[PDB]
């Protein structure tokens, strides 16, 4: 007897200032009898290309959680990162070794998180061998180097600074430079970022993040 | 008049009657690969154009080139020439 959308109201999401495009669309909710409780805890996943306006990030998705509401503006925060499934299936190929590392670490803001990085061996310019498998010792050494680099980068930074590092893929450059001598590599990427635990909420840190 | 199998294939080669099967395999018949785009191999020519009656002709040694990714027959080869080619690759 009631069309639900008569009682619904529209709200506009906004993104972190770390991203170039703050506008990421809109959502809707039942009107307060409150709406804020339904809004809080909501997560929206969006490709980095939309937020940064470049197709170079088309294979990367960011999950942002709604943390505050003000005047039909939904103020969100970074919640997670992942790649597109198609990109991952593209990277994995026959005749090469897949090296994967995972690290659990907390930021300077007490944001406990988990980083998954992936990389693949590559054949050199003058290679004539079909494949480029790496000995287990090289795999272990590379994994240690990657874990140390990830831990150093995360611990010595804040979450906003962490995302500021993820967007330009500086960490991948540092990893490949460090692991260069051990074994040549390709497709070095921070595959995934999970947010395990959250500190006590601080609306001030969110407003300052959003300007 | 009568026509032998191998001459018939040569005459039909420049026409649209002749189609080539995939390279044969086995003792004696082996694909000698000069290069990524060159090979020498035996094929079974098919004469005729599944609604008409075509048939396969005697196997013939052919020179095949990969032009535009498809294997195209450049020349026919005698048995002696093919045998010499196989030895020339082995040495």
């Amino acid at each position: 007897v009631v069309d639900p959308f008569t009682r619904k109201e529209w709200f506009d999401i906004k993104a972190p200032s770390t991203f170039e495009n703050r506008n990421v669309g809109k959502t809707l909710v039942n009107k307060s009898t409150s709406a804020s409780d339904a809004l809080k805890g909501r997560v929206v996943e969006v490709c980095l290309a939309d937020l940064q306006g470049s197709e170079d990030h088309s294979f990367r998705k960011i999950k942002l959680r709604v943390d505050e509401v003000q005047g039909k503006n939904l103020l969100t925060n970074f919640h997670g990162m992942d790649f597109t499934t198609d990109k991952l299936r593209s990277m994995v190929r026959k005749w090469q070794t897949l090296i994967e590392a995972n690290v659990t670490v907390k930021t300077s803001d007490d944001y406990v998180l988990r980083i998954f990085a992936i990389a693949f061996t590559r054949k050199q310019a003058n290679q004539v061998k079909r494949h480029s498998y790496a000995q287990s010792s090289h795999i272990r050494a590379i994994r240690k180097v990657i874990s140390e680099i990830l831990t150093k980068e995360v611990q010595g930074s804040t979450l906003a600074q962490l995302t500021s590092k993820l967007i330009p893929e500086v960490i991948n450059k540092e990893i490949e430079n460090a692991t260069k001598d051990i074994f040549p590599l390709q497709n070095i990427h921070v595959r995934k970022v999970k947010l395990l635990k959250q500190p006590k909420f601080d609306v001030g840190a969110l407003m300052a993040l959003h300007g | 008049c009568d026509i032998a199998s191998t001459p018939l294939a040569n005459i039909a080669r420049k026409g649209l009657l002749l189609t080539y099967s995939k390279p044969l395999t086995g003792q004696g018949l082996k694909t000698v690969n000069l290069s990524p785009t060159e090979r020498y191999c035996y094929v079974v020519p098919r004469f005729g154009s599944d609604l008409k009656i075509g048939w396969d002709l005697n196997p013939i040694a052919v020179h095949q080139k990969k032009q535009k990714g498809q294997w195209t027959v450049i020349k026919f080869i005698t048995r002696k020439g093919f045998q010499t080619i196989t030895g020339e690759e082995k040495e």
Partner: peptide
């Protein structure tokens, strides 16, 4: 020279073949 790269390619084709 860059002709060296061509030699790598054809050898690669041989090996995989």
């Amino acid at each position: 020279p860059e002709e060296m790269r061509k030699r790598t390619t054809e050898m690669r084709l041989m090996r995989e073949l």
